[PDB]
Design an enzyme around this catalytic site. Structure first.
Site, PDB file in Angstrom:
ATOM      1  CG  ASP A  33      -1.934   1.150   1.074  1.00 29.28           C
ATOM      2  OD1 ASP A  33      -1.836   1.920   0.124  1.00 29.28           O
ATOM      3  OD2 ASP A  33      -2.832   1.189   1.981  1.00 29.28           O
ATOM      4  CB  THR A  34       1.963   3.461  -2.761  1.00 28.19           C
ATOM      5  OG1 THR A  34       0.716   3.572  -3.452  1.00 28.19           O
ATOM      6  CG2 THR A  34       2.800   2.362  -3.411  1.00 28.19           C
ATOM      7  N   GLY A  35      -0.314   4.156  -0.364  1.00 30.78           N
ATOM      8  CA  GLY A  35      -1.032   5.234   0.321  1.00 30.78           C
ATOM      9  C   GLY A  35      -0.967   5.185   1.828  1.00 30.78           C
TER      10      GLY A  35
END
Ligand SMILES: CC(C)(C)NC(=O)[C@@H]1C[C@@H]2CCCC[C@@H]2CN1C[C@@H](O)[C@H](Cc1ccccc1)NC(=O)[C@H](CC(N)=O)NC(=O)c1ccc2ccccc2n1
Lengths: 99, 99
Positions: free
Chosen positions: A25-27
């Site tokens: 998850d880059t967020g």
């Protein structure tokens, strides 16, 4: 490896002696793992998602293997619907987003 | 580009002809933008994050430029804490995770 985004980017992780599936998850700033009985001391924390905040236990210097790549860092444990690998650990495994 | 993850993966988007900043978010199924006036027909929807569920306006077939790349797809508009570009549009711009 290369992971496309047609489906949720789930990989196998190993933490606390257990295999789990988790979302890359880059967020997410942080790594959040579903309730599990990790040993040792922890610090209370509240973290914010789209819908508000949840209470978690902050564990430091946790050993964690992500898709076969070793990492060590902070893991937050509490009542999340998904195990999420956030940027604190994605950087350790040399992940990038490319387009 | 290739984007590393030491910092939040924030990019400029254009939506409704207006520039905004948004987070490239592999952990998000959907694209969620803060409340704004947006040209298009919408329908009420609910979506979930950590912390629970929120009410949003679902706009289909919206033109959006993401870091200079074109997408046309579903944008959810509502009281999100942050603008996020989810997989529905990351796939349109050809984004992948690599490690
Ligand atoms: C994990 C934590 C450290 C708390 N970070 C975050 O949650 C930050 C918070 C930021 C500010 C608020 C706006 C969202 C951004 C990005 N997020 C990360 C971000 O990637 C976050 C991670 C996640 C995945 C799965 C389930 C829950 C949460 N995804 C989401 O918020 C997206 C929103 C959406 N598309 O509808 N949720 C999901 O795509 C999603 C999927 C399965 C689910 C099952 C049950 C309940 C909820 C579920 N939500």
């Amino acid at each position: 490896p290369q992971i496309t985004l047609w489906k949720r980017p789930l990989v196998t992780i190993k933490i606390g002696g257990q295999l789990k599936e988790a979302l890359l998850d880059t967020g997410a700033d942080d790594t959040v793992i579903e309730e599990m009985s990790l040993p040792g001391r922890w610090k209370p924390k509240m973290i914010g998602g789209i819908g508000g905040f949840i209470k978690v236990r902050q564990y430091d210097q946790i050993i964690i293997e992500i898709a076969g790549h070793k990492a060590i860092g902070t893991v937050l444990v509490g009542p999340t619907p998904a195990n999420i690998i956030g940027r604190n650990l994605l950087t350790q495994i040399g992940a990038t987003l490319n387009f």
